[PDB]
């Protein structure tokens, strides 16, 4: 099996569909990665994650280095063995979470020192942690510029990220086993500014990565602005490598991002909103706790193929969530992750069949009816 | 399939092993019933409950009449359909929970009026609720005498329960569909007093039930006293019908109760203590959160056949429980319920093979080493 081979099978406009072959499995693209920050996709066994259609999941350098610890996971056989997921795992580098979640941080050219609520993260340490975890797709250690940012602050932040991208490349390439078995993605920054996004794309392509993430979005800018930035930013990246939009997003965000050339996605929404009582359906999200569902015998969604919709009613899940029952979180999460995977499957099939424009139109008309 | 047929295949001393055949399945005895008070065995899909070996689960009239409501469950197709468990369900009658959980209660000869935190429960209403739920084994509506009780207060309480037992019998027999498809168990009371337990057994046998529960135990009396009461109480019940010890118990409680002629058990321990970090093993319970498990690659128990012990380490489950992760509760609960079922299977096989005395001795020597 190859370390990393991306093949585009079909295109429609800027949208692409294809596969990433890796040692631990194939990733069908466009792909959605369930988030498994604490070495678990919340409320799901790995077999259930797989049964929903997921090819790859996301972990987090920041969370795992604190609990249970990166050396500890390596001693226990690596993240895959530890959590029981034998397929590809992509790990975020800590670049964003260190700034989002730390109680105190000190930023410098070397890296970020932080208090968890004392540790260091640098490009070299981030790559090492991801090696200890046994990540299949390693993310470069970057800085997610706050939004909004002045052009000058966005520029100095992006430039630091590009120096850190080169340091990440070098640290990864130094570790022969990592370079042989894993892939490394760079992260474009530049806030909402076209010239900075271009300078960032140029720097990343000069270094050379297996894939290219669009960082610095899904930071409060809203969909119109995110799409505007994607319109110019994604074409700047190498066409022949995967494009990963970090942290995105709602179903319509995903569709529009695919229309703009994105191949990979991750988002906490399906899991987090599942636990909170929000279920995704082809007619839009529903709040299952609402009294209107108390006697509704229909499944969460009328077409969904997931095991939850084959067996249990809205009325039952309504009862479970209102009662604070763990099975409620389990069933809502499984359905929402399955819904996301079915969305990705419909995206892939429609691109392959040359009818993605019509799919996106039909999807929106019904989802927002 | 028969409505209810109990067959004893083998005996060793007072211990029995056999089967209860019912329309929705066979119950192997001695049997352990996982508790599913809120129409869910907490943190388990029904298929997982079944995979652990459970033949029957327990529900509760009191909880379900308040949330989601008995008429509502009946409108939705009954409890089995609602929760997705198609095998036998035994429902407790509300007699004990109404007094344990209600914020205010008014006890009278008619029944119990209570505030949930305003409703009524009586023998007739309890039987009706259990009909609406579609229970397979219906419990008579009784009163669980507090412990300790004076002989006179235990007597007046037991006598009320025996009048309520006759009213429960009559209400059940009046509902032709219930009498055709379900079974009715009476509940012996009498606190710790042999003469009252005898008077209660006599009254219940005169009425006639499909099975006989020993009520009024597991109320704070401790194992020595519980066993002392079982020593004289279980022989008073009809030998040819199942004997059900309500609310019991820890593994050693179950073994000793089987040695005293009990055929059926229910207890919240495996589920509740699973969520709290306690795992049952053949070498006794362990607190998985303890630091000693942080790097332990062994499964929860070295012999356990459950899916959890086939796939995940103590170290991983330790991490999950300490992190407050739902999957931690899921895996601990599945293991503990599987452990309980494996205990019951070893009990059944050892009785059938005429080596239960040796099993009980070996079990205790290792469990309490
Ligand atoms: C959608 C929902 O997901 C929640 C909450 C707020 O948005 C999220 C999702 N947005 C998001 N943008 C990102 C940008 C980067 C980035 O530039 N670099 C690196 N290394 N990782 C990133 C990860 C990102 N996640 O960010 C934290 O919680 C998530 O809204
Ligand atoms: C073991 C653990 O389980 C917890 C906590 C305290 O014990 C429990 C278990 N004991 C228990 N004794 C019972 C007696 C009766 C009875 O006499 N009548 C009827 N109708 N139902 C009964 C159910 C019973 N459950 O009682 C409430 O919480 C349970 O300790
Ligand atoms: Cl989540
Ligand atoms: Cl429980
Ligand atoms: Zn579904
Ligand atoms: Zn086990």
CSV table of N, CA and C in Angstrom, one decimal, chain B residues 160-274:
chain,number,residue,atom,x,y,z
B,160,UNK,N,-51.3,-5.4,54.2
B,160,UNK,CA,-51.7,-4.5,53.2
B,160,UNK,C,-51.2,-5.0,51.8
B,161,UNK,N,-49.9,-5.4,51.8
B,161,UNK,CA,-49.4,-5.9,50.5
B,161,UNK,C,-50.1,-7.1,50.1
B,162,UNK,N,-50.6,-8.0,51.0
B,162,UNK,CA,-51.3,-9.2,50.6
B,162,UNK,C,-52.7,-8.9,50.0
B,163,UNK,N,-53.4,-7.9,50.6
B,163,UNK,CA,-54.6,-7.5,50.0
B,163,UNK,C,-54.4,-6.8,48.7
B,164,UNK,N,-53.3,-6.1,48.5
B,164,UNK,CA,-53.0,-5.5,47.2
B,164,UNK,C,-52.6,-6.6,46.2
B,165,UNK,N,-52.0,-7.7,46.7
B,165,UNK,CA,-51.7,-8.8,45.8
B,165,UNK,C,-52.9,-9.4,45.2
B,166,UNK,N,-53.9,-9.6,46.0
B,166,UNK,CA,-55.2,-10.1,45.5
B,166,UNK,C,-55.8,-9.1,44.5
B,167,UNK,N,-55.8,-7.8,44.8
B,167,UNK,CA,-56.3,-6.8,43.9
B,167,UNK,C,-55.5,-6.8,42.6
B,168,UNK,N,-54.2,-7.0,42.7
B,168,UNK,CA,-53.4,-7.1,41.5
B,168,UNK,C,-53.7,-8.3,40.6
B,169,UNK,N,-53.9,-9.5,41.3
B,169,UNK,CA,-54.3,-10.7,40.6
B,169,UNK,C,-55.7,-10.4,39.8
B,170,UNK,N,-56.6,-9.8,40.5
B,170,UNK,CA,-57.9,-9.6,39.9
B,170,UNK,C,-57.9,-8.6,38.8
B,171,UNK,N,-57.1,-7.6,38.9
B,171,UNK,CA,-57.0,-6.6,37.8
B,171,UNK,C,-56.3,-7.2,36.6
B,172,UNK,N,-55.3,-8.0,36.8
B,172,UNK,CA,-54.6,-8.7,35.7
B,172,UNK,C,-55.5,-9.7,35.0
B,173,UNK,N,-56.3,-10.5,35.8
B,173,UNK,CA,-57.1,-11.5,35.3
B,173,UNK,C,-58.3,-10.9,34.5
B,174,UNK,N,-58.7,-9.6,34.8
B,174,UNK,CA,-59.8,-9.0,34.1
B,174,UNK,C,-59.4,-8.5,32.7
B,175,UNK,N,-58.2,-8.4,32.4
B,175,UNK,CA,-57.7,-7.8,31.2
B,175,UNK,C,-57.3,-9.0,30.3
B,176,UNK,N,-58.2,-9.5,29.5
B,176,UNK,CA,-58.0,-10.8,28.8
B,176,UNK,C,-56.7,-10.8,28.0
B,177,UNK,N,-56.3,-9.8,27.3
B,177,UNK,CA,-55.1,-9.8,26.5
B,177,UNK,C,-53.9,-9.9,27.4
B,178,UNK,N,-53.9,-9.2,28.6
B,178,UNK,CA,-52.8,-9.3,29.5
B,178,UNK,C,-52.7,-10.7,30.1
B,179,UNK,N,-53.8,-11.3,30.5
B,179,UNK,CA,-53.8,-12.6,31.1
B,179,UNK,C,-53.4,-13.7,30.1
B,180,UNK,N,-53.7,-13.4,28.8
B,180,UNK,CA,-53.3,-14.4,27.7
B,180,UNK,C,-51.8,-14.3,27.4
B,181,UNK,N,-51.2,-13.1,27.5
B,181,UNK,CA,-49.9,-12.9,26.9
B,181,UNK,C,-48.8,-12.6,27.9
B,182,UNK,N,-49.1,-12.3,29.1
B,182,UNK,CA,-48.2,-11.9,30.2
B,182,UNK,C,-48.3,-12.9,31.4
B,183,UNK,N,-47.3,-12.7,32.3
B,183,UNK,CA,-47.3,-13.5,33.5
B,183,UNK,C,-47.4,-12.5,34.7
B,184,UNK,N,-47.8,-12.9,35.8
B,184,UNK,CA,-48.0,-12.1,37.0
B,184,UNK,C,-47.2,-12.7,38.2
B,185,UNK,N,-46.3,-12.0,38.8
B,185,UNK,CA,-45.6,-12.4,40.0
B,185,UNK,C,-46.1,-11.7,41.2
B,186,UNK,N,-46.2,-12.5,42.3
B,186,UNK,CA,-46.5,-11.9,43.6
B,186,UNK,C,-45.2,-11.6,44.4
B,187,UNK,N,-45.3,-10.7,45.4
B,187,UNK,CA,-44.2,-10.3,46.1
B,187,UNK,C,-44.4,-10.6,47.6
B,188,UNK,N,-43.5,-11.4,48.1
B,188,UNK,CA,-43.5,-11.7,49.6
B,188,UNK,C,-42.9,-10.6,50.3
B,189,UNK,N,-43.6,-10.2,51.4
B,189,UNK,CA,-43.1,-9.2,52.4
B,189,UNK,C,-43.0,-9.9,53.8
B,190,UNK,N,-42.9,-9.1,54.8
B,190,UNK,CA,-42.7,-9.6,56.2
B,190,UNK,C,-41.4,-9.2,56.8
B,191,UNK,N,-40.7,-8.3,56.2
B,191,UNK,CA,-39.4,-7.8,56.8
B,191,UNK,C,-38.5,-9.0,57.1
B,192,UNK,N,-37.9,-9.0,58.3
B,192,UNK,CA,-37.0,-10.1,58.6
B,192,UNK,C,-37.6,-11.2,59.5
B,193,UNK,N,-38.9,-11.2,59.6
B,193,UNK,CA,-39.6,-12.0,60.6
B,193,UNK,C,-40.2,-13.3,59.9
B,194,UNK,N,-39.8,-14.4,60.5
B,194,UNK,CA,-40.1,-15.7,59.8
B,194,UNK,C,-41.6,-15.9,59.8
B,195,UNK,N,-42.3,-15.7,60.9
B,195,UNK,CA,-43.7,-15.9,60.9
B,195,UNK,C,-44.5,-15.0,59.9
B,196,UNK,N,-44.0,-13.8,59.7
B,196,UNK,CA,-44.7,-12.9,58.8
B,196,UNK,C,-44.4,-13.4,57.3
B,197,UNK,N,-43.1,-13.8,57.1
B,197,UNK,CA,-42.8,-14.3,55.8
B,197,UNK,C,-43.6,-15.5,55.4
B,198,UNK,N,-43.9,-16.4,56.4
B,198,UNK,CA,-44.7,-17.5,56.2
B,198,UNK,C,-46.1,-17.1,55.9
B,199,UNK,N,-46.7,-16.2,56.7
B,199,UNK,CA,-48.1,-15.7,56.4
B,199,UNK,C,-48.2,-15.1,55.1
B,200,UNK,N,-47.1,-14.4,54.6
B,200,UNK,CA,-47.1,-13.8,53.3
B,200,UNK,C,-47.0,-14.8,52.2
B,201,UNK,N,-46.1,-15.8,52.4
B,201,UNK,CA,-46.0,-16.9,51.4
B,201,UNK,C,-47.4,-17.6,51.3
B,202,UNK,N,-48.0,-17.9,52.4
B,202,UNK,CA,-49.3,-18.6,52.4
B,202,UNK,C,-50.3,-17.8,51.6
B,203,UNK,N,-50.4,-16.5,51.9
B,203,UNK,CA,-51.4,-15.7,51.2
B,203,UNK,C,-51.1,-15.7,49.7
B,204,UNK,N,-49.9,-15.6,49.3
B,204,UNK,CA,-49.6,-15.5,47.9
B,204,UNK,C,-49.9,-16.8,47.2
B,205,UNK,N,-49.6,-17.9,47.8
B,205,UNK,CA,-49.8,-19.2,47.2
B,205,UNK,C,-51.3,-19.5,47.1
B,206,UNK,N,-52.1,-19.0,48.1
B,206,UNK,CA,-53.5,-19.2,48.0
B,206,UNK,C,-54.1,-18.4,46.8
B,207,UNK,N,-53.6,-17.2,46.5
B,207,UNK,CA,-54.0,-16.5,45.4
B,207,UNK,C,-53.6,-17.2,44.1
B,208,UNK,N,-52.3,-17.5,44.1
B,208,UNK,CA,-51.7,-18.2,42.9
B,208,UNK,C,-51.1,-17.2,42.0
B,209,UNK,N,-49.8,-17.4,41.8
B,209,UNK,CA,-49.0,-16.5,40.8
B,209,UNK,C,-48.1,-17.4,39.9
B,210,UNK,N,-47.7,-16.8,38.9
B,210,UNK,CA,-46.7,-17.5,38.0
B,210,UNK,C,-45.3,-17.5,38.5
B,211,UNK,N,-45.0,-16.6,39.4
B,211,UNK,CA,-43.7,-16.6,40.1
B,211,UNK,C,-43.8,-15.8,41.3
B,212,UNK,N,-42.8,-15.9,42.2
B,212,UNK,CA,-42.9,-15.3,43.5
B,212,UNK,C,-41.6,-14.6,43.8
B,213,UNK,N,-41.7,-13.3,44.1
B,213,UNK,CA,-40.6,-12.5,44.4
B,213,UNK,C,-40.4,-12.4,45.9
B,214,UNK,N,-39.2,-12.4,46.4
B,214,UNK,CA,-38.8,-12.0,47.7
B,214,UNK,C,-38.6,-10.5,47.8
B,215,UNK,N,-39.6,-9.8,48.3
B,215,UNK,CA,-39.5,-8.3,48.4
B,215,UNK,C,-39.0,-8.0,49.8
B,216,UNK,N,-38.8,-6.7,50.0
B,216,UNK,CA,-38.4,-6.2,51.3
B,216,UNK,C,-37.0,-6.4,51.8
B,217,UNK,N,-36.1,-6.9,50.9
B,217,UNK,CA,-34.7,-7.1,51.2
B,217,UNK,C,-33.9,-6.1,50.3
B,218,UNK,N,-32.6,-6.2,50.5
B,218,UNK,CA,-31.7,-5.2,49.9
B,218,UNK,C,-32.2,-3.8,50.2
B,219,UNK,N,-32.5,-3.6,51.5
B,219,UNK,CA,-33.0,-2.3,52.0
B,219,UNK,C,-32.2,-1.8,53.2
B,220,UNK,N,-30.9,-2.2,53.2
B,220,UNK,CA,-30.0,-1.8,54.2
B,220,UNK,C,-29.6,-2.8,55.3
B,221,UNK,N,-30.1,-4.0,55.1
B,221,UNK,CA,-30.0,-5.0,56.2
B,221,UNK,C,-28.6,-5.7,56.2
B,222,UNK,N,-27.9,-5.7,55.1
B,222,UNK,CA,-26.6,-6.3,55.0
B,222,UNK,C,-26.7,-7.8,54.7
B,223,UNK,N,-25.6,-8.3,54.2
B,223,UNK,CA,-25.7,-9.7,53.6
B,223,UNK,C,-26.0,-10.8,54.6
B,224,UNK,N,-25.4,-10.7,55.7
B,224,UNK,CA,-25.7,-11.8,56.7
B,224,UNK,C,-27.1,-11.9,57.0
B,225,UNK,N,-27.8,-10.7,57.2
B,225,UNK,CA,-29.2,-10.7,57.6
B,225,UNK,C,-30.0,-11.1,56.4
B,226,UNK,N,-29.7,-10.6,55.2
B,226,UNK,CA,-30.4,-11.0,54.0
B,226,UNK,C,-30.4,-12.5,53.8
B,227,UNK,N,-29.2,-13.1,53.9
B,227,UNK,CA,-29.0,-14.6,53.8
B,227,UNK,C,-29.8,-15.3,54.8
B,228,UNK,N,-29.8,-14.8,56.1
B,228,UNK,CA,-30.6,-15.5,57.1
B,228,UNK,C,-32.1,-15.5,56.8
B,229,UNK,N,-32.6,-14.3,56.3
B,229,UNK,CA,-34.0,-14.3,55.9
B,229,UNK,C,-34.3,-15.2,54.7
B,230,UNK,N,-33.4,-15.2,53.7
B,230,UNK,CA,-33.6,-16.1,52.6
B,230,UNK,C,-33.6,-17.6,53.0
B,231,UNK,N,-32.7,-17.9,54.0
B,231,UNK,CA,-32.7,-19.3,54.5
B,231,UNK,C,-34.0,-19.9,54.8
B,232,UNK,N,-34.9,-19.1,55.5
B,232,UNK,CA,-36.2,-19.6,55.8
B,232,UNK,C,-37.3,-19.1,54.8
B,233,UNK,N,-37.1,-18.0,54.1
B,233,UNK,CA,-38.1,-17.5,53.3
B,233,UNK,C,-38.3,-18.2,52.0
B,234,UNK,N,-37.2,-18.6,51.3
B,234,UNK,CA,-37.4,-19.1,50.0
B,234,UNK,C,-38.1,-20.5,50.0
B,235,UNK,N,-37.8,-21.3,51.0
B,235,UNK,CA,-38.5,-22.6,51.0
B,235,UNK,C,-40.0,-22.5,51.3
B,236,UNK,N,-40.5,-21.4,51.8
B,236,UNK,CA,-41.9,-21.2,51.9
B,236,UNK,C,-42.6,-21.0,50.6
B,237,UNK,N,-41.9,-20.6,49.6
B,237,UNK,CA,-42.6,-20.3,48.3
B,237,UNK,C,-42.8,-21.6,47.6
B,238,UNK,N,-43.7,-21.6,46.6
B,238,UNK,CA,-43.9,-22.8,45.8
B,238,UNK,C,-42.6,-23.2,45.1
B,239,UNK,N,-42.2,-24.4,45.2
B,239,UNK,CA,-41.0,-24.9,44.6
B,239,UNK,C,-41.0,-24.8,43.1
B,240,UNK,N,-42.2,-25.1,42.5
B,240,UNK,CA,-42.3,-25.3,41.1
B,240,UNK,C,-42.5,-24.0,40.3
B,241,UNK,N,-42.3,-22.8,40.9
B,241,UNK,CA,-42.4,-21.5,40.3
B,241,UNK,C,-41.1,-20.8,40.5
B,242,UNK,N,-40.8,-19.8,39.6
B,242,UNK,CA,-39.6,-19.0,39.8
B,242,UNK,C,-39.6,-18.2,41.1
B,243,UNK,N,-38.4,-18.0,41.6
B,243,UNK,CA,-38.2,-17.2,42.8
B,243,UNK,C,-37.3,-16.0,42.4
B,244,UNK,N,-37.8,-14.8,42.7
B,244,UNK,CA,-37.1,-13.6,42.2
B,244,UNK,C,-36.7,-12.7,43.4
B,245,UNK,N,-35.4,-12.5,43.6
B,245,UNK,CA,-35.0,-11.6,44.6
B,245,UNK,C,-34.8,-10.2,44.1
B,246,UNK,N,-35.6,-9.3,44.5
B,246,UNK,CA,-35.7,-7.9,44.0
B,246,UNK,C,-34.5,-7.1,44.4
B,247,UNK,N,-33.8,-6.5,43.5
B,247,UNK,CA,-32.8,-5.5,43.8
B,247,UNK,C,-31.4,-6.1,44.1
B,248,UNK,N,-31.2,-7.4,44.0
B,248,UNK,CA,-30.0,-8.0,44.4
B,248,UNK,C,-29.2,-8.5,43.1
B,249,UNK,N,-27.9,-8.3,43.0
B,249,UNK,CA,-27.1,-7.6,44.0
B,249,UNK,C,-25.6,-7.7,43.5
B,250,UNK,N,-24.7,-7.6,44.5
B,250,UNK,CA,-23.3,-7.8,44.2
B,250,UNK,C,-23.1,-9.3,43.8
B,251,UNK,N,-22.0,-9.5,43.1
B,251,UNK,CA,-21.8,-10.9,42.6
B,251,UNK,C,-21.9,-12.0,43.7
B,252,UNK,N,-21.3,-11.7,44.9
B,252,UNK,CA,-21.4,-12.7,46.0
B,252,UNK,C,-22.8,-12.8,46.5
B,253,UNK,N,-23.5,-11.7,46.5
B,253,UNK,CA,-24.9,-11.8,46.9
B,253,UNK,C,-25.7,-12.7,46.0
B,254,UNK,N,-25.4,-12.6,44.7
B,254,UNK,CA,-26.1,-13.5,43.7
B,254,UNK,C,-25.8,-15.0,44.0
B,255,UNK,N,-24.5,-15.3,44.2
B,255,UNK,CA,-24.1,-16.7,44.3
B,255,UNK,C,-24.8,-17.2,45.6
B,256,UNK,N,-24.7,-16.5,46.7
B,256,UNK,CA,-25.3,-17.0,47.9
B,256,UNK,C,-26.8,-17.1,47.8
B,257,UNK,N,-27.5,-16.2,47.1
B,257,UNK,CA,-28.9,-16.3,46.9
B,257,UNK,C,-29.3,-17.5,46.0
B,258,UNK,N,-28.5,-17.8,45.0
B,258,UNK,CA,-28.7,-19.0,44.2
B,258,UNK,C,-28.6,-20.2,45.1
B,259,UNK,N,-27.6,-20.2,46.0
B,259,UNK,CA,-27.5,-21.4,46.9
B,259,UNK,C,-28.7,-21.5,47.9
B,260,UNK,N,-29.5,-20.5,47.9
B,260,UNK,CA,-30.7,-20.5,48.8
B,260,UNK,C,-32.0,-20.5,48.0
B,261,UNK,N,-31.9,-20.8,46.7
B,261,UNK,CA,-33.1,-21.1,45.9
B,261,UNK,C,-33.6,-20.0,45.0
B,262,UNK,N,-32.9,-18.9,44.8
B,262,UNK,CA,-33.3,-17.8,44.0
B,262,UNK,C,-33.0,-18.1,42.5
B,263,UNK,N,-33.9,-17.8,41.7
B,263,UNK,CA,-33.8,-18.0,40.2
B,263,UNK,C,-33.6,-16.7,39.4
B,264,UNK,N,-34.0,-15.5,39.9
B,264,UNK,CA,-34.0,-14.3,39.1
B,264,UNK,C,-33.5,-13.2,40.0
B,265,UNK,N,-32.8,-12.2,39.3
B,265,UNK,CA,-32.1,-11.1,40.0
B,265,UNK,C,-32.2,-9.9,39.1
B,266,UNK,N,-32.2,-8.7,39.7
B,266,UNK,CA,-32.0,-7.5,39.0
B,266,UNK,C,-31.1,-6.5,39.9
B,267,UNK,N,-30.3,-5.7,39.3
B,267,UNK,CA,-29.6,-4.8,40.1
B,267,UNK,C,-29.0,-3.7,39.3
B,268,UNK,N,-29.0,-2.5,39.8
B,268,UNK,CA,-28.4,-1.3,39.1
B,268,UNK,C,-26.9,-1.3,39.2
B,269,UNK,N,-26.2,-2.1,40.1
B,269,UNK,CA,-24.8,-2.1,40.3
B,269,UNK,C,-24.0,-2.1,39.0
B,270,UNK,N,-24.1,-3.1,38.1
B,270,UNK,CA,-23.2,-3.2,37.0
B,270,UNK,C,-23.3,-2.0,36.1
B,271,UNK,N,-24.5,-1.4,35.9
B,271,UNK,CA,-24.6,-0.2,35.1
B,271,UNK,C,-24.1,1.0,35.9
B,272,UNK,N,-24.7,1.3,37.0
B,272,UNK,CA,-24.3,2.4,37.8
B,272,UNK,C,-22.8,2.4,38.2
B,273,UNK,N,-22.3,1.3,38.7
B,273,UNK,CA,-20.9,1.3,39.0
B,273,UNK,C,-20.0,1.4,37.8
B,274,UNK,N,-20.4,0.8,36.7
B,274,UNK,CA,-19.7,1.0,35.4
B,274,UNK,C,-19.4,2.5,35.1
